[PDB]
């Protein structure tokens, strides 16, 4: 079974930087994987970030985001935040190759900006 695990709460930096590790468990040992940071609010959902990367090799970046890949976790750093950006941020890992395709959606991270 596919499980994605992100922290419950992160407070944001005085400058506007929130950082959180996003760990996943593949039943396979997949190589091409695609991470998406999502924002939830009511039934709606909005794209914040999206990255595709291959294995151990570096993360490729939506400009608002940066990160690192250190094994089977991804250190997603969001910046350029306003007080208005406080909400629920979902980690979405997709394992793309080799087969089978697996989809993983997290429980969400509450980011606070004050």
């Amino acid at each position: 079974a596919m499980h994605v695990a992100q922290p419950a709460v992160v407070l944001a930096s005085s400058r506007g930087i929130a950082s959180f590790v996003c760990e996943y468990a593949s039943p396979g040992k997949a190589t091409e994987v695609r991470v998406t940071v999502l924002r939830q609010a009511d039934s709606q959902v909005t794209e914040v970030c999206a990255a595709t990367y291959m294995m151990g090799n570096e993360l490729t970046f939506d400009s608002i985001c940066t990160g690192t890949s250190s094994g089977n976790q991804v250190n997603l750093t969001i910046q350029g935040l306003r007080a208005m950006d406080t909400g629920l941020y979902i980690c979405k890992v997709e394992l793309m190759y080799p087969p089978p395709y697996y989809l993983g959606i997290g429980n969400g991270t509450q980011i606070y900006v004050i």
Partner: antibody
């Protein structure tokens, strides 16, 4: 305004090929991943094929593997299905569908009947 | 290949009555990456429920989803005349995407 209009169904003799098209509207198509799903007359829903956001990754149902290709012209906002060595059992209504943000098939095409007989 | 078996084939319920549709999987289904669809014949499927229990935009209150692991239920709390249709459960957490054979729901007279 979300719309998926598919076209170019019809009749094919067995062995010969046929390419289906689905044209997307009022969402930034580039951003959402796509599928095809057929429905044999009076039978259930069968997933046929999946295409990545870019097209760098493609997945096919066992029963079409080797014979069908999925592709996308992003700037034309169009999804395609090349079908190659059509069998009589490939006769179905072919649905184009969009994968939701969080995984389900949220929007569907209208349907396009492909008949494979000599 | 995660197989999905829905039961029964046919629910025979009068309008107003509750309808309870079952979907059971060959193995456990992710973190509830399981959908429900509706199909009124000669029309495309329409998404009803995703994430086992969350309702699709513009689907009315009467539709209701439950379950976890290999067991999932769709509840229609009262059958209105537009609800008499064919329903498919689907898993979408891993490839191949698979549907169940569908439960048809007919008018009982």
């Amino acid at each position: 305004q979300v719309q998926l209009v598919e076209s170019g169904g019809g009749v094919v003799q067995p062995g010969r090929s046929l390419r289906l098209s689905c044209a997307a509207s009022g969402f930034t198509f580039s951003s959402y991943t796509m599928h095809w799903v057929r429905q044999a007359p009076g039978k259930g829903l069968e997933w046929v094929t999946f295409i990545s956001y870019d097209g760098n990754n493609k997945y096919y149902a066992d029963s079409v593997k080797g014979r069908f290709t999925i592709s996308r012209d992003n700037s034309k906002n169009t999804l395609y299905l090349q079908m190659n060595s059509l069998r009589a059992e490939d006769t179905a209504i072919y649905y184009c569908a969009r994968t939701g943000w969080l995984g389900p098939f949220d929007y569907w095409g209208q349907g396009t009947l492909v008949t494979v007989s000599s | 290949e995660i197989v999905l078996t829905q039961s029964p084939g046919t629910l025979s319920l009068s309008p107003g009555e509750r309808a309870t549709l079952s979907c059971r999987a060959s193995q456990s289904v992710g973190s509830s990456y399981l959908a429900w669809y509706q199909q009124k014949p000669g029309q495309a499927p329409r998404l009803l429920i995703y994430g086992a229990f969350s309702r699709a935009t513009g689907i009315p209150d009467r539709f209701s989803g439950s379950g976890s692991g290999t067991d999932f239920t769709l509840t229609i709390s009262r059958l209105e005349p537009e609800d008499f249709a064919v329903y498919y459960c689907q898993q979408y957490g891993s490839s191949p995407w698979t549907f169940g054979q569908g439960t048809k729901v007919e008018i009982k007279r």
